[PDB]
């Protein structure tokens, strides 16, 4: 790692890992998607 572009983190939930873009508040289930990783 890391396969995430700057600004993104993984977040743990019981239902799975999601992706959070801190600067914009964006959350999604698909790996980003910015980037550049």
């Amino acid at each position: 790692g890391s396969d995430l572009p700057a600004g993104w983190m993984r977040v743990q939930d019981t239902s799975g890992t999601y992706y959070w873009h801190i600067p914009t508040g964006t959350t999604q289930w698909e790996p980003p998607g910015r980037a550049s990783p």
Binding site: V11, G25, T27, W29
Partner: peptide, 9 residues
């Protein structure tokens, strides 16, 4: 962090 997002359609 914010809550888990909904599943897309």
């Amino acid at each position: 962090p914010p809550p888990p997002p909904p599943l897309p359609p």
